Amino acid sequence: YKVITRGMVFERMMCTSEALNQTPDMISATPARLTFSQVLVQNPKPIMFRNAGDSSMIDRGLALAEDVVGSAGDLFDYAVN
Amino acid sequence: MINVSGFGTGIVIVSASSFPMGFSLSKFADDESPISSKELEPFGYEMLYDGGLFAFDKAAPLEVSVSVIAGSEDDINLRILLNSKKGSFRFLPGIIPDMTTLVATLPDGGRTVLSNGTIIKGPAIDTIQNTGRRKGNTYTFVFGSYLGAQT
DSSP: OOEESSSOEEOSEEEEEEEEOOOTTOSSSOOEEEEEEEOOOSOSSOOOOSSSSOOOOOOOOOOOOOOOOOHHHHHHHHHHO | OOOOOOTTOEEEEEESSSOSSOEEEOOBOSSSOSEEEOOOOOEEEEEOTTSOEEEEEOOOOEEEEEEEOTTSHHHHHHHHHHTOOGGGSOOOSSOTTOEEEEEEETTTTEEEEEEEEEEEEOOSSOOBOTTSSBOOEEEEEEEEEOOOOOO
């Protein structure tokens, strides 16, 4: 969330704590104390790109390719269809 | 000369839900001040460590109080307003039952449009004085809008 209090814009904010208070001093409304904390990020300003072709590549590491059974005939029928 | 009289003053109280059309206060008390408001404080000052002064804004409620004769229709209407819990009304980005008091002071035409407010306190039952005559009833409202004065 982004919290804008008084001309003081704060980005990358998440609610850390929150406390409601129900007392005979306020029977209709309820006072509440919220506390947010900023999420520290290595780059405050990131670099992006417009078109969808030109990402920097991301590597998935070792995957341990899982196992399926379809035989080559099923793959061939799928490619034919 | 300047006429600072108070005769002919009228008040029109219109509430968002209790009295959408509103009622009129004309019967004011004789022992208590018919209208009494504490001094507004919309500014504040702080002392710098070099002896200097800094001036800033503060939140300034306008606490007005109107006194009416015990048993009158205005007193009954004000008691009905007092006995209206805020939790029994639908809520809008505005204020629980927003009630405004149009104050027409004298044939001078001074109109005050105190708005954005609500009642705060008042007497539930009439108090019988030592003299035997019921005390005038003073009901206090608070407001956040205090502009609109003319002439």
